[PDB]
Design a protein around this nucleic acid. Structure first.
Lengths: 94, 25, 129, 81, 96, 87, 206, 216, 121
RNA sequence: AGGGGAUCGAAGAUGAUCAGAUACCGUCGUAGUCUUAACCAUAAACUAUGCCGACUAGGGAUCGGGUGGUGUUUUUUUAAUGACCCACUCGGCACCUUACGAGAAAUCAAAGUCUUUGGGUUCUGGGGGGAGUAUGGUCGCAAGGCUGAAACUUAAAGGAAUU
């Protein structure tokens, strides 16, 4: 039976889009169908900035952050616990 | 069987029948 | 496209009655629609309809009382004889006491009972009850 | 509303609806009179001229074509006719 | 329009579409094609005499266990080999 | 309904809604009967005299029950300028 | 009609506009509420306080039409009208359901909270949808303190007023109690103002 | 002892309301099966069949019996009630109570001579419950109730002497076609036959005029 | 676990319902008083009933809690039901004797009740 | 049939894992993936919902055009224009809440206005297999496309939901 009004994901009025590739298992998926998560994490790990600051030339003020957009397939997103299943009532939630 | 594999099997079988057909007709 | 004018008018009237509305904007305009409204007024199934006149087809605004149940059209206009009136009234009416099959005939637009007394028959337009 | 007057609409309702959706079909445009500087030479100009009207006496643009209402020249005065 | 023509002058289209659509009926195809006169062993008859060629025994289908004690009889008119069934208990002794 | 001799057959001649004329069904457990007290001169209600308004279940469910009630109230004189026919 | 002494007096008009009762909601506005009067540049839609008064006195006559003054039931789930219902349930009869309203007081006939009312007065129909839903099943008229955006389903009598404010909710309850008490015959003349302060029906922050 | 809880129960016990017509006319809700039997003492019961319903659990089923019982006298009243119970007799007992609580009246009429007494239905009325539809066309005198034995019995307890019947769908589902037939005889008063067109004053509710004998 | 059973929970609330002062703020003094009040067939059961009661006796001192209903709860709120602000009850006050209104609100005033103080913003 | 041929990569060659693995995983790798000229007429080519027209519960956002508001911002503070705010309108991709109404249900602003059955029109289906197979035509270089059975066999398959 039908599960969602948007059958695959977010595609009403186009018919076809250019597909994208998963970053984990290299699975080919439609760009709309892919689940995208944006990474804003800093270039350094958690903490350890104070160690860097003492050994930092210039008055620090650098603190670079890496920015990356990651596309996950349905199988990989569920397996990596990024996307989890929900109840029917919770399915309609956005 | 899957629809694809069943159709491929009957298509190969049709090819074999037609190859046998070409020998007489 | 728009094929029949009375079919749209009666459908709008039926929809307005189902929505509890006492009015409906009839806008395919016609003379059959006007006559179909007059015969409805004769039995009191509607109130007053006044025809707005532009330089085009036109519009009709009829006030509806809560007495009409269903008015429809019989398309195509079948060539019903004088012996088939009873058959049509036995398939389009709930009971024999009330209900009027509105049919067009060579003497004008009227209902089934008047057709029997005048002993004339024509084409079947629809039914009102 | 189940009981409303579709036969005598208020002024606000008619002014809001499209020209094709009113009780009676009527235009929403108007005719304007524009005069060039100095010479009077009155001429009638449509609201949506679709062209560049010029008074035959003076070769001066009185309005510019526009998808909607025509934009009249700055050195012109308009009056409803 | 319910997917069907509804004009006062459109009767050939309904009549033709009826003709093709009634062919899907099993009874309509069975009667008009006349397969009972071609492939039916009885050839459109209620009874048919024959010659008892041999006595036969077949086993039952699933959920059951019996030997039905059938018989193989060749019809006279058609000359086809047809299996029959002796209904009642202790009735194969009568036939031979 | 009546038979030939004129005595009234059929039982519990049903009520009708005061906004859209429609028979209120026996099991139509959505129709209420609005009662309005009558004032007289001194500004005090007179017990026993009511202005009976009936609304069917369909009108109440639509949300037009409020619109209908003011129309009947204004028509009968209960209210003065809360309704406008030429909306 | 009425003896024409029930018209909106300037004293009552001053009180009603002092609590910002006329101040309605933004562009959100149901088509079933034609009481709106123009619109402020900010976006707040102004409610005609005049139409509220005729609807308020109409509700008072409906409440006064009840013979026994206990079938009247006032329900409120929002915390901004809990005290107003309690005072309304002690001055003009009626039973209070201030606070939680259990699902079944009107339908379940063996519960300890089972009552058989003839009129229900809710404060916020959106916040009291359960009370309205049950009142539909048992044929009871509903009177609600509704706004322009509030739903009007199963609501027979509407009281156009502001529900997003303690001041407006308390004032409407105070005015409703004043009108119904005069109609009953306990508040003598209709011209003398009531001897209790309108802030009594108000709800304190603690 | 009854000790009624509802206002209607107190009124009927005291003898104020003496006819079921007033409750039907005013659409007063009632959930007390004393009220129905007291006002309608000739009230009979007829059970069609008992069909067990099984729910699967960790160890074995939980077989319960479902019974359909019709309650209605043959002069204009009928009611239907379905209830499930562990014991078949208990389901029948509960079914009688529900069918008593769901008693509905009938608008009889004529195929037509305006001569005798209402035998058939006034108009054509149908009801749908799931996929089954039951059409009740008026029939001439002496035709009888031509229908399935189950719905014929239900219509015979409803007071109808003659009627025509049509059914569409999986009519073998007895519960669905009984409820669909029940809706059909429930919409007879819904139809607005032109005889009931004259305006009439709205009767005041009996509870309003008898509020003294209410509560306490 | 030390989760109390509903039997001792409901009875303890009922004890405080009608006996505010009897249950003292100490365990030992009112532990025997609970026995004198309620028919308890177990020494262990009345020990736990008094323990929860004493603990509830301590909590109510800090402030009101849920499900108290101790015949004295209304005493404060029936006394605390007459705030009735002396003068400034959000009427004819909080301003310089004039009500601050807007232009559209003024048109509402000029409808029927124009005789009022207005302050158009 | 030419040009092009870097990555990926039907076949194939090896590395493993495995009882077996010419499968999943790893490394190479031809045809192919790109383009020119000519064919192939297929898909879960799906919104599994044909096209045209009329009516029917509300709410917001958004795309394109238009209208009005001394509205805001912008250049020369202030004209225009442009970009925004508010209100309205027409056509859209759509969406949120309800269920008058429909449906077997899942669900649907149509899948509603169908036993109160009729706005106009086209195509397809009559239990599951055999079977989209066999043969006969027809198109194509081929692979394959269109039309398309019968004999025989079975009492079940199938759809939506509940525990």
């Amino acid at each position: 039976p039908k599960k969602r009004a948007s059958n695959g994901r977010n595609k009403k009025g186009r018919g076809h889009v250019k597909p994208v590739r998963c970053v984990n298992c290299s699975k080919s998926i439609p760009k709309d169908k892919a689940i995208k998560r944006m990474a804003i994490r800093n270039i350094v790990e958690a903490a350890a900035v104070r160690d860097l600051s003492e050994a930092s030339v210039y008055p620090e003020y650098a603190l670079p952050k890496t920015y990356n957009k990651l596309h996950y397939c349905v199988s990989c997103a569920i397996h990596a616990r990024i996307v989890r299943v929900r109840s029917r009532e919770d399915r309609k939630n956005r | 069987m899957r629809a694809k594999w069943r159709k491929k099997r009957t298509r190969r079988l049709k090819r074999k029948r037609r190859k046998v057909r070409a020998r007489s007709k | 496209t728009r094929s029949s004018v009375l079919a749209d008018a009666l459908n709008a009237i039926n929809n307005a009655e189902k929505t509890g509305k006492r009015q409906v904007l009839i806008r395919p305009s016609s003379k059959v629609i006007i006559k179909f409204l007059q015969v409805m007024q004769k039995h009191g199934y509607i109130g007053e309809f006044e025809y707005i006149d532009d330089h085009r087809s036109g519009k009709i605004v009829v006030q509806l009382n809560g007495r009409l149940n269903k008015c429809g059209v019989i398309s195509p206009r079948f060539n019903v004889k004088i012996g088939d009136i009873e058959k049509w009234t036995a398939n389009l009416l709930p009971a024999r006491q009330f209900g009027y099959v509105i049919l067009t005939t060579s003497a004008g637009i009227m209902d089934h009972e008047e057709a029997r007394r005048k002993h004339v028959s024509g084409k079947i337009l629809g039914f009102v009850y | 509303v189940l009981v409303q007057d579709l036969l005598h609409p208020t002024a606000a309702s008619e002014a809001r609806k499209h020209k094709l959706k009113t009780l009676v079909q009527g235009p929403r445009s108007y005719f304007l009179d524009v005069k060039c500087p100095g010479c009077l030479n009155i001429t009638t100009v449509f609201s949506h001229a679709q062209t560049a009207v010029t008074c035959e006496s003076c070769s001066t643009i009185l309005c510019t074509p526009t998808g909607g209402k025509a934009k009249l020249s700055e050195g012109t005065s308009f009056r409803r006719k | 329009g319910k997917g069907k023509p509804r004009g006062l002058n459109s009767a050939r289209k309904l009549r033709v579409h009826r003709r093709n659509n009634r062919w899907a009926e099993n009874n309509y195809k069975k009667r008009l094609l006349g397969t009972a006169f071609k492939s039916s062993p009885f050839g459109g008859s209620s009874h048919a005499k024959g010659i008892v060629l041999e006595k036969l025994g077949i086993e039952s289908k699933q959920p059951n266990s019996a030997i039905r004690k059938c018989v193989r009889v060749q019809l006279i008119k058609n000359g086809k080999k047809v299996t029959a069934f002796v209904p009642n208990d202790g009735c194969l002794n009568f036939v031979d | 309904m009546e038979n030939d001799k004129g005595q009234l057959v059929e039982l519990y001649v049903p009520r009708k809604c005061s906004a859209t004329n429609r028979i209120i069904k026996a099991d139509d457990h959505a129709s209420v009967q609005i009662n309005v007290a009558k004032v007289d001169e001194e500004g005090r209600a007179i017990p026993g005299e009511y202005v009976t308004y009936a609304l069917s279940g369909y009108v109440r469910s639509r949300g037009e029950s409020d619109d209908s009630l003011n129309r009947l109230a204004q028509n009968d004189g209960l209210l003065k300028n809360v309704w406008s026919y030429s909306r | 009609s009425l003896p024409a002494t029930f018209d909106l007096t300037p004293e009552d008009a001053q009180l009603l506009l002092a609590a910002n009762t006329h101040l309605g909601a933004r562009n959100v506005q149901v088509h079933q509420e034609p009481y709106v009067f123009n619109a402020r540049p900010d976006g707040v839609h102004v409610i005609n306080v005049g139409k509220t008064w005729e609807k308020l006195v109409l509700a008072a006559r409906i409440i006064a039409a009840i013979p026994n003054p206990e079938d009247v039931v006032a329900i409120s789930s929002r915390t901004f009208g809990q005290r107003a219902v309690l005072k309304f349930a002690a001055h003009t009869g009626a039973t209070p359901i201030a606070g939680r309203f259990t699902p079944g007081s009107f339908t379940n006939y063996i519960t300890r909270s089972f009552k058989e009312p003839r009129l229900v007065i809710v404060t916020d129909p959106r916040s009291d949808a359960q009370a309205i839903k049950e009142a539909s099943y048992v044929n009871i008229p509903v009177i609600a303190l509704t706004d322009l955006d509030s739903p009007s389903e199963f609501v027979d009598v509407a009281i156009p007023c502001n529900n997003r404010g303690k001041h407006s909710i308390g004032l409407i309850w105070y005015l409703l109690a004043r009108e119904v008490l005069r109609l009953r015959g306990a508040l003598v003349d209709r011209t003398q103002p009531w001897s209790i302060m309108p802030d009594l029906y108000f709800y304190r922050d603690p | 002892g009854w000790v009624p809880v509802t206002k209607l129960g107190r009124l009927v016990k005291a003898g104020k309301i003496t006819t079921i017509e007033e409750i039907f006319l005013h659409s007063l809700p009632v959930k007390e099966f004393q009220i129905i039997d007291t006002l309608l003492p000739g009230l009979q019961d007829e059970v069609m069949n008992i069909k067990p319903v099984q729910k699967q659990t960790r160890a074995g089923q939980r077989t319960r019996f479902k019974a359909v019982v019709v309650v209605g006298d043959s002069n204009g009243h009928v009611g239907l009630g379905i209830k499930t119970a562990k014991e078949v007799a208990g389901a029948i007992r509960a079914g009688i109570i529900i069918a008593k609580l769901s008693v509905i009246p009938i608008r009889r009429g004529y195929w037509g001579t305006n001569l005798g007494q209402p035998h058939s239905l006034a108009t054509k009325t149908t009801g749908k419950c799931g996929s089954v539809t039951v059409r009740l066309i008026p029939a001439p005198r002496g035709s009888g109730i031509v229908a399935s034995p189950a719905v014929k019995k239900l219509l015979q307890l409803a007071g109808v002497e003659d009627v025509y019947t049509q059914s569409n769908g999986k009519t073998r589902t007895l519960e669905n076609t009984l409820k669909a037939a029940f809706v059909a005889i429930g919409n007879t008063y819904g139809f607005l036959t032109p005889n009931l067109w004259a305006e009439q004053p709205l009767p005041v509710s009996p509870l309003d005029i008898y509020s003294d004998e209410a509560s306490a | 676990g030390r989760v109390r059973t509903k039997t001792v929970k409901r009875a303890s609330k009922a004890l405080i319902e009608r006996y505010y002062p009897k249950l003292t703020l100490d365990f030992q003094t009112n532990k025997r008083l609970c026995d004198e009040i309620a028919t308890i067939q177990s020494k262990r059961l009345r020990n736990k009933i008094a323990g929860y009661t004493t603990h509830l006796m301590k909590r109510i001192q800090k402030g009101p809690v849920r499900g108290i209903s101790f015949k004295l709860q209304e005493e404060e709120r029936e006394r605390k039901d007459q705030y009735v602000p002396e003068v400034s009850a959000l009427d004819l006050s909080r301003s310089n004797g004039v009500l601050n209104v807007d232009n559209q609100t003024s048109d509402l005033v000029k409808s029927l009740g124009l005789k009022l103080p207005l302050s158009v913003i």
